[PDB]
C-alpha cells in the first residue's frame, strides 16, 4: 500500500521516490485520512511539515486529507 497513487496530485513513485522526512529511509511516510471508511495518503503529498506529521503520529487526533478536509463533518 506504500506505492499507491494517494491523490490526484500524488508525487510519490516507486521509480523515483527518495527520503524527505528525517524518519524515512526506504519507504514514504504515510498518514490515514479518516473521511468515510478512510484511506492512506503519503504525508509529503499533503504538504505536511515534519513536525506536524510527527505531532499527528503522537496523538489521537484524526487527520483529513486536503481533498476531504472541507467536507462537513458530522
Amino acid at each position: 500500500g506504500y506505492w499507491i497513487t494517494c491523490c490526484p496530485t500524488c508525487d510519490v513513485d516507486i521509480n523515483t521516490w527518495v527520503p524527505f522526512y528525517s524518519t524515512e529511509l526506504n519507504k514514504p511516510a504515510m498518514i490515514y485520512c479518516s473521511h468515510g471508511d478512510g484511506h492512506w495518503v503519503h504525508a509529503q503529498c499533503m504538504d505536511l511539515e515534519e513536525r506536524t506529521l510527527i505531532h499527528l503520529s503522537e496523538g489521537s487526533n484524526k487527520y483529513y486529507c486536503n481533498e476531504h478536509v472541507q467536507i462537513a463533518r458530522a
Binding site: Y21, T23, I31, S34, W40, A43, S57
Partner: peptide, 12 residues
C-alpha cells in the same frame, strides 16, 4: 492519527 514510517531510527 494512524501513520507509517514516522518512527525515529536508532543511532543516537
Amino acid at each position: 492519527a494512524r501513520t507509517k514510517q514516522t518512527a525515529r531510527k536508532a543511532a543516537g
